[PDB]
Every structure is written in structure tokens, then in C-alpha cells.
Design a protein around this ligand. Sequence first.
Ligand code: VCA
Length: 133
Amino acid sequence: GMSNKFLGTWKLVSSENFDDYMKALGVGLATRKLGNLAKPTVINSKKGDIITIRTESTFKNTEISFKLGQEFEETTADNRKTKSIVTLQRGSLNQVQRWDGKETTIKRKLVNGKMVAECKMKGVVCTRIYEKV
Ligand SMILES: CCCCCC/C=C\CCCCCCCCCC(=O)O
């Protein structure tokens, strides 16, 4: 199952290519400007088989709760209404979001104690690195 090392509170320390990733998602300029300035805290928790990923920032907060492999309805930070599924693949927690015939993937994995999120949309790849606590 998912490693308990995922669980806890994480702080963004690095973000690479987020602007072009947001452009690929259709996010407008003013929103992208604030999105690029955000340094969110991500809190991963688990209760039973239900996993929760909560994101907190001054600009926007989000929260998703899910069981592995079961599709759920998600509202994203940029207010897309997606159908999403999270799977586990070689220690990588992989989230796929589908809406309006499009899809994007967010793959979260642990690397030397950091959480690395790789966000992909239409060949555009963004990497965000988080530190524990
Ligand atoms: C907290 C989310 C980012 C900052 C606030 C929202 C800013 C722009 C909305 C554009 C969509 C953001 C997609 C979220 C990708 C998060 C990937 C990650 O967890 O590192």
C-alpha cells in the first residue's frame, strides 16, 4: 500500500515550469501570476482506506479524499470539475484528472525524503519539490 512516509505536512521549496503547465490547463494570466507566487503547504493524511490530500495557500485551498483506484469527483485549484483516479505505481502516487475530453497527470513520489510532484499536460512537464514539515 501507500508508504506512511507520504503522510504529514509538506512545504513547497521548488517549482519548475509551473507557468507553462498552468497555461496548458487554460489558466488566465492574472491567476497564473498569483499561482507562481504561491508556496503552498500540502497535508497528506489517511483514515482507514481513505487518503486525503489538502493544499493550503493564501490564494487558494483545495482538498481531495479518495480510495486508491476508485474514481472520484474533484474540484481543482483553478476550478475545473474533473473525474479523477489515484493509483500506486512503484512507490509513486499517480493522480489522473479528466475533464472535457482532456487529461493531466500529477505523479507524487518520495526522493531522499522530499516529495516530488511531476505535473504533465499536453507534453508540458512541471516539477515541484516539497520538504517535510
Ligand atoms: C495550491 C495550488 C497552487 C496555487 C493556487 C492555485 C494557483 C493556480 C491554479 C492553477 C492550477 C493549479 C494546479 C495545481 C497543481 C498542484 C501540483 C502540486 O501539488 O504540486
